[PDB]
């Protein structure tokens, strides 16, 4: 139905960990620079817990917060309460980025077209995971080594996948 391309933005470890105590388990500013680069001028779709961990709006992108809380408001952000209400707010967007966390990944699971996933080669302690996925009809179309250095102390790779509709 939806006219906008539903994309997933995620970084996860060797065991699909994406979260530790409502926080990222690693510090990788270069990966965030890639995220900022890839997502510029596009909607970011965030579960309320994800947004509040980030703490403030992110520049040059539509910020959309998913919550059941009907009284919930945030400055320079937009609040949706259902997948459909998002599709409404995004009815004229070309591409949209589901940005997390896990509950919000689960929610949009059946709608994903494209998949921007950063794979990190390390086993972090974590409580929050990226959902298991049926990769039938999916094709890896891109992969490249991330920048490892003093400020980015881990080995990671940028993967992009596309569902053959
Ligand atoms: N490594 C990565 O790429 C990423 C990691 N993370 C990490 O993941 C963790 C957060 O994930 P998680 O705990 O799942 O939190 P979420 O970001 O998914 O927040 C879930 C919230 O969204 C709202 N919500 C959930 N389902 C619905 C629904 N069906 N309808 C309306 N609103 C709904 C609820 O908000 P409310 O209770 O207010 O109504 C719920 O508390 C953190 O550790 C974070 O740092 C997050 C993004 C990316
Ligand atoms: C850009 O800053 C943040 C980003 C994220 C989520 C995230 C991080 N990386 C990737 N590849 N995908 C994602 N969805 C989660 C955060 O929570 C701590 C952030 O705050 C610093």
Gap from CA of 155 to ligand 1 centroid (Å): 26
| 60 backbone φψ class: left, alpha, beta (φ>0; ψ -120 to 50) | left
**Total domains present in the chain:** 1
Cα separation of 68 and 151, whole Å? 38
Structural domain containing residue 21? 1-165
Q: Ligand 1 test: best mutation among 17, 25, 101, 120, most atoms within 8 Å of CB?
A: 101
The strand pairing partners of 140, in sequence order, are 161
Whether 120 and 155 have beta carbons less than 8 Å apart is answered as yes
Q: How was this structure determined?
A: X-ray
Burial of 100 (0-12, 13-18, 19+ CB in 10 A): buried
How would you list the strands of the sheet with 138-145, edge to edge? Answer: 78-80, 63-66, 44-47, 95-100, 5-12, 114-120, 156-163, 138-145
Cα separation of 7 and 5, whole Å? 6
Resolution (A): 2.9
Does the N-terminal peptide bond of residue 101 adopt cis geometry, omega within 30 degrees of 0? Answer: yes
End-to-end Cα separation, the chain, in angstroms: 12
Gap from CA of 140 to ligand 2 centroid (Å): 22
- CATH number for 136: 3.40.430.10
Name residues contacting ligand 2 (CB within 6 A): 9-11, 23-24, 31-32, 35, 53-54, 99-100, 118
Gap from CA of 149 to ligand 1 centroid (Å): 30
């Amino acid at each position: 139905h939806h006219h906008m391309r539903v994309s997933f933005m995620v970084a996860m470890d060797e065991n699909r960990v994406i979260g530790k105590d409502n926080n990222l388990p690693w510090r990788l500013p270069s990966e965030l620079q890639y995220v900022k680069k890839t997502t510029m001028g596009h909607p970011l779709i965030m579960g309320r817990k994800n947004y509040e961990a980030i703490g403030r709006p992110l520049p040059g992108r539509r910020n959309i917060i998913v919550t059941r809380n009907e009284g919930y408001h945030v400055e320079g952000c937009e609040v949706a309460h259902s997948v459909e209400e998002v599709f409404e707010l995004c009815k004229n967007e070309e591409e949209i980025f589901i940005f997390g966390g896990a509950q919000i990944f689960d929610l949009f699971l059946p709608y994903v077209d494209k998949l921007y996933i950063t794979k990190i080669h390390h086993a972090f302690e974590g409580d929050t995971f990226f959902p298991e996925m049926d990769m039938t009809n999916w094709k890896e179309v891109f992969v490249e080594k991330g920048l490892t250095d003093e400020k980015n102390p881990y080995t990671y790779y940028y993967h992009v996948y596309e569902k053959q509709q």
